[model samples]
Target: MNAIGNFLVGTPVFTIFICLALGYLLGKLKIGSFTLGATVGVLIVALLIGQLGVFPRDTLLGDIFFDFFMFAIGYRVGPSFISSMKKFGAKIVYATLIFLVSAFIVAYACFKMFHIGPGIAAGIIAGGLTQSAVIGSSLETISKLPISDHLKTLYSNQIPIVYTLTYVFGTIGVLIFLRDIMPKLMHIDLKKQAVKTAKELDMIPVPVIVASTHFYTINDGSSLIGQTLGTVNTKFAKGLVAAGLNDSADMASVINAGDVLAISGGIDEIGRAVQEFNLLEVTGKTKAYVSKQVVLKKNFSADVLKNAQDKGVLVATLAGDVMDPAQFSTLHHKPAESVTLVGQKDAVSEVQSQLGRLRAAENIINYSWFALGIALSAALGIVGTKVSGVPIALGGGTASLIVGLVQSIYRDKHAHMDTIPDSLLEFFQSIGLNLFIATVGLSAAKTFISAIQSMGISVLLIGAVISILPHIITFVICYYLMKMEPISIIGAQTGADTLSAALNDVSERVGSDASPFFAAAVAPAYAIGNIFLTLMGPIFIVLLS
Candidate 1:
């Protein structure tokens, strides 16, 4: 065992992978309903191995990964944050202000009352609020502290320690509150609320994952026969898209009576689309698929549904409300009062003109702009502004966030330059976040163990309170003042904290399609937390010190 330990530790890259693989698998271990997701698992596993006296040769790996994580988070939220503000602008803004103000007050109170160190205090907020951005931002702030190098290192080290200690209660507590407690407080039935929301869109909750494709041969007497592939694809309500055609060469190729068309999409949608057609293969599973969403521009008028009867595209109002407009109203129109068009990648692009050519520069992420945005914001963050001799800066995370927000808000002006695939961004974010957390656990293991031992149960106790206060305060505020739908309010809080645990529960209770409403209410609030809560770290440190 001793020889094995040394050998494993000798290979840093292999060790990292080992930690990740084991940690990810272990995260699936659940205690009843609560899970110590992969994020927490990585920390625990890393800390356990780190106790064996093996550390990465250099801290540079962690730093690079941490910055990458920060930038990806900012980029992910940027476009959605701006769009969210437009939808539930007044209500979301109000909720954001209330939640942030309450969170700031609670965090500040904890700092002074507990006499917590800068790092620990920031960790308390990060863990309690479940905002990992705080850790990076706080560390960045601590690095440039106008204090002795020893004190700076001490403060910086305390962050991950406090973060790990508090995180268990922070994440789990909120998930519990939102899933079990909030419903009682709000007097809401999750399933009923979800079902109610679903009815508005004329949909029911999907119970299972939907991934299937079927092949269909066009009927000789069918209206779809002799129609352009673009013309026959418009009227689908299900998430259906064309996969292939036996006769038609490409998307623009016309459909003939005997052409064999391959249909693919979500399972239920596939079932619906081919219900009318005689399929060559009635059932099978194929994971490969390509789908796109397109929004219509004003002054675009065509009988979209009539034009595409047998084509594989599906078009509807953005919220199943209304697709046909009497006249374009830029002033009084609802935010995103356009169309929710979805189809196979090829089909969506082909029918672009029917909806006035929705602008989508799909594929090819602009790494140059993305890199520039991070570099610029990081430079800005380094330019310190002093408040009573304690230097204060936005920190890299918040600075990049501001840059991302600005760029996203005006994304349309330079739409071509600001493009990234959703899957690619999510990939970057996942790896970046997991890597940073793993590094934090490994580096802080020794210091964290020492801190916990010396500090007694005080850190744990403090973290528990910090974890609960912000949400409790927000709940009270939402209960009394906010007239939002119960699910929307809960959804907003979940998003504000980026609580996946809560999101899963909420989505399960309600229909899957209820996401947009929750996002409309929650996304902007979450964005606000990213900036405000992250910035609060340095402020708490300076004032507490």
Candidate 2:
């Protein structure tokens, strides 16, 4: 064990991994609705490890990983944000602004009332919001203050201490309040309400009625054998389409008599189509459909989706293997045949039915576009505006977020350019967030115990209040005054805190599985919420000081 410790002491990378592994393992200890997540758990481990005084100063690494995580977050939200803004543009904006402004006002009042310093105030807000970026952003803002370097450093140190102290209540406190108290006060069963709301939206979490493929033997001397196959293909069934011709060479190949054609589409559509034509015999069973690469020629949109949905045609983005016409980078919407997509025969046919053909989606990761975007955004972050004699920059996070939104909205024009795969983006985000929190925790660890001792129990009390007040206030207003649905309220609440777990819990609140109803709710609010929290960090300090 000593030898292992020595090795870890010598190897900083190994030590980092050790913290991550141990943190993830420990995070699984769940008490009711609250589970200490891996991201937070790593911080605890780092704190204990810091006592040994062997870990390297992790600030530089922390900043890089934090920025990367922020970029991934922006990318993830871009599609939803822009789309939601267009759909429910004004209402979403109002709800988010009201909630955030309320939080800020109440936070200031609490800080002033409790005689909390700027540093501790920033920590309280950061802890309550669960935004790690606030720590760094707030600290950066504090560094530019006209105070002495010693005082600035002291102020900065207060952030991690208070953040660490109050983070537990900040996360778990909100979870309990939303899941338990809010529903009761509203006199509504969240589970039943969620079920009622889910049905209205026609959003099922995991759709069981999925598309499938089948084989059909063409009738000899049939009307389909000679006439143009395209017209005949469309005439056969409302939802079904011809995926491949058994004897023909291409999709447009002539339909031949006695040809064992591959009939692929929605299951119901195929049944209806075969019943109408009575010209083909279906094989006894279905074939295991695999993801086939195809191209899109037209952009998928609301109108396209509506038309597709009307004809019993459900177009989805390749969720492992499907297509939707809306997702920005994924196949929800792409210029016809520009980006390569993988789908089963039914999915490809459904896509071709609308977009024209399956040879348009070309899989090409345009590194040039990505590199250019990052460079441009990071530059904007560097050249931020000055406010109150302080250099207040939007930072890399803001820049990346706006740019990602623009990129996603205009994705059709850049069909040749590919966005990073969801899997890869998730990898960067998860690791970057963990690395960021771990570093921040380690840096503050030595002084943490001392700081907590100095602050006493007030930090805990203040953080819990801060965490619950904004959410509860917003929930009440939206539920009672705005007459917003439970789905939208819960979505707004989770989005306000940027809590994915809370969103999932609410989605599964009822007995029925629910598709994310407030995907629309979360997007517009997510970026605004984080930015508000980070910007408020410095503002809180200034106000308090």
Candidate 3:
């Protein structure tokens, strides 16, 4: 053991590299996702070493990353929550309240009554369920309170373990358990919420007919040199608004240009009018109305869309195979092809011809507003980390906002903001989370064992109850009290829905009136709610303590 320690210490790079490589190997040789699973394993190992006193702690790095990760996670997760509430509406309110209050109390009990320190307690609560509220709040409380340097450093070092382990098993595991058990306990089968419709999901809706739909060169030769949305007239003041939008107006919580439009004004008006207008793409009524295929090509564009339209059909984007907007990139609107037609066979040749020239370009690294967005959101979240870290909620939601704005203005960009956020989340689940959770495991192993020996399992029972109550109650309150429709009530039950999903849910439940009033209705409360969660973290700790 001593010799192994020495070797690890002597060759840090090789040791770390070996671990990563081994993890990669195990990941590749699996049925489930390797990357995410490996992260969990790595974090557990790191935690074991740290707790066993086999590796010396690096205090400095711990401090910075701990604070940084806490706020970053919070901000990323918090904002845009209002939309979730909106979708789940009254049905989920009770559950949300129950979840928030119960979790807070449980975490408090674990710390104050059970003798866990606020930092570790908060970390456990935050990490265990993959909720940023606990992390942000704990960081705020610790920063303000009189915590010792050693304790702070210890918490920091172990954070990777907490994060990784929770993700490794805690977040996913716990949630899976809950998904498995809770539904049964409440007699709730989630699938009963919506209409399974190939019939319902037909055309790509448009907000207006804009001039940019014409794509006419300003100088008759330059690309985007001059076609203006203001020029088109069939519907939108400009034609640009017609072919470019990618979401359904019936489902929008917020509307922005370049979002796919799913207009339903009949096949000809929606499609043939494009020809009458000399437009690029438009979907006409077709026989294969509900069998839209999922395409995962490099990038999708207007030409492919034009062909789809010309073929008397429509097109929409898909995410991880889920048809609705649940995990779609933006919170506004996401497009999906639901129906198909036995094409006017001749048009297929022309449609395929137009599709041949299609190319899709997207931002894979980060949100288009990466630096600026990070700067802006981080600033808000960090500051709020001291109070209500709700802006953290907007982090992902804002992806839709930023992407929509970019696509609307730039007019040539793909608006899959969720892709970057998803990638970011995946990275955290695999790498940072493993390190965080491993540290947590290390810290908890002996100490937690010792505490169990002295205190027994009673405390754990209380802690658990606390954690679960908030979610259940919140869902109940939101569902019944607010009289929110089932579709609107889906997301807030547990912070699961994406912007598009929530909007779509509401649209399906409430109809077209949803889009016109989506953003204004949801944004105000959403912005406030997430930042508020960050703040609650600190207060909950103090109250419990």
Candidate 4:
């Protein structure tokens, strides 16, 4: 055992990898719908292995990985965050403020009331709020504190210990509160309310292959060449409407040779019409018809839709709900709604340009922009100012997040720039966070047992109170003051706390089709909550000091 331990201590890098493998394995072990997750799992394993003195205390490796994690988080949520602000605006901002402020007040009160150290206070917020970013930001602040090296190391080690203790309740507490308690408090039938909200938003499920419009050019030898629009609809394309004739809105006109006809119907009917009439499909610059799902970053106006249709693109669905293709001229779409556009490749691209961002194109990251963003964030972090004789700065974590938001907003306007695949970002977020946490666990391992002994069971009790109170306060404000819908209140509560697991659990309880209700409310609040809660870590430490 001594030999093995000594070898592991000698090969520090191998110890880290071993922790990752075993930690991931441990993370997958579920206990009644609850798993530690990869981050916690890695931390747990690292803490255990760290007792063996496998690696000396170190922040260099952890800092590098933490920055990566922070930047990735900012980039991933940037576009959606901006879109949510535009769509939900004030209501979401209000909810986020209420939740985060309440949490901060309660956490601070706990800190002073219990006489706990700055590290524990930050840990409580990090774990209780379920915002992992807090751990990094808090550590960053702690490092900058005017304290002895021994004390800094002691406080930093306490963070992971307290975080581990509080996190379980932090997640489960919010889950139970939002899914079970909040609904009961409001006298809400969650499933019924979810259904009602879904209907109100026109988010009712529809067939994926909905009716769409397509333009067909009348060939010289085709039977549709001389056929009247009425005759074409009645004889060949039954149930299909010939809505327009060659730049003319009047459908009563005859289809002359070389004239183009706009036909609206289901795929089967459109196919039959083309076959029967021997018509040539006209897709502007592209030959094949393609469908692309786009999430609108801006409102899709009627004029834009008309311009799209003129180029042979059809807005088939809005927010997953099928639209009447004939009503394309009258419809206006709001930001954050999902729209499916059907047309030729080039025409669909044109329509997408006017409506919003293409959902599938978020692959292949622009490393140039990524490198620049990180470098700029680091430089920004270096620029600090003194507040009341104390040095204060954005810090690397917060600066990276701000830069990420700016980059995302810029990328949204210029789609061709700063492209990042969703999968790659997820990889970076998961791996980066876990790697940093693993180092934290290892560094803190020697002090973990002593810290827990000193803190006692109070950490668990403190965590529960911190986790539960903020949600209760936020719920009351959302339900009473805002008079928001019951289901949305639940979503907002979960979002404001940054508990996606709770959101998913509530979504399932409400029924699968009712997810949109939770999703729509969650998006903006979640984004706002993540940003503010992370920033609070540093502020909490500074104020306490």
Where does model 4 exceed 4 Å of error?
31-38, 57-61, 135-157, 184-192, 202-269, 274-364, 480-482, 503-517
| Model 1 C-alpha lDDT per residue in residues 1-545, reported as the tens digit of each score | 67866876677777777779888887788877566777778878988887876575355566556566666656656655655565444666676677778777776777777777776777777877777766655666677667799888778766777788887777667777778888887777877776676466433434545343455666666564555555455555534556546523265776655655666545666666666654445233333333334455534444555444245554544233223333322322322323444445455566655554453545766678777877897687776677765556666656765776677666654333436667765666667667877776776676666788887687888788767777788777777765666766775667666665565556556655565455445556665666666667777777766
Best by TM-score: 2
Task: Score candidate 3 by lDDT.
Answer: 0.40
Cα displacement (Å) at residue 456, model 2: 1.8
Ranking by lDDT: 4, 2, 1, 3
Q: Rate the local accuracy (lDDT) of all candidates.
A: 0.64, 0.66, 0.40, 0.69
Q: Write the per-residue lDDT of candidate 3 for residues 13-117, one digit (tens) a residue.
A: 554445455555554456554223454455445545543334443433333334334333434333333334444335344444555565555555556666665
As for lDDT, the candidate ahead, 1 or 2, is 2
Per-residue lDDT over 1-545 for candidate 2, one digit per residue giving the tens place of the 0 to 100 score? 45765676688887787788899887787877367767667878888887776455667677666666667767777766755666554666677888888888888788878888788888888777887667656767887778888888788667777887777677666777777777777788876676676666545466445555567777775554655445665566444545455423243556655566566556666777767766566663434334333445565434654444333233443332234334433443345533232223364455556564543234456777777877777777777667886666776666676777677767645444564677867787778878877776776777777887888888888888888888878877877788876667766767767775565566556444444445656777787776676677777777777
How many clashes does each candidate structure show, in the order listed? 7, 26, 114, 1
Name the runs in model 1 displaced over 4 angstroms. 1-9, 31-33, 56-60, 67-80, 136-150, 194-361, 366-370, 373-377, 403-419, 481-484, 498-511
In candidate 1, the residue pairs with backbone N, CA or C atoms under 3 Å apart (3 or more residues apart, or in different chains) clash, namely 194-510, 231-308, 232-310, 232-311, 233-311, 233-312, 233-313
Q: Which residues of candidate 2, in runs, are more than 4 Å off?
A: 1-6, 31-33, 201-364, 412-414, 508-513
The count of residue-pair clashes in candidate 4 stands at 1
What lDDT tens digits, residue by residue, belong to model 4 across residues 1-545?
77887888888789888889998998788887666666567777888888876467566676667678767767765665654555554776677788788887888888888887777787877877788767655776678678889989877767877887677677556677667667777787988888887877655665466666677777788453555554554564233555556544443676566766766657877887677657778784334455677766655466775555444455656432345555555444345545677645455676687777766354656577778788888898767666654455556766776787677777644334535766776677667767876776777677678878888788888889888987778877777776876766776767678775566567678776776546666767765676677677778787776
Better of 2 and 4 by TM-score: 2
* Residue 153 lDDT, candidate 1, scale 0-100: 78
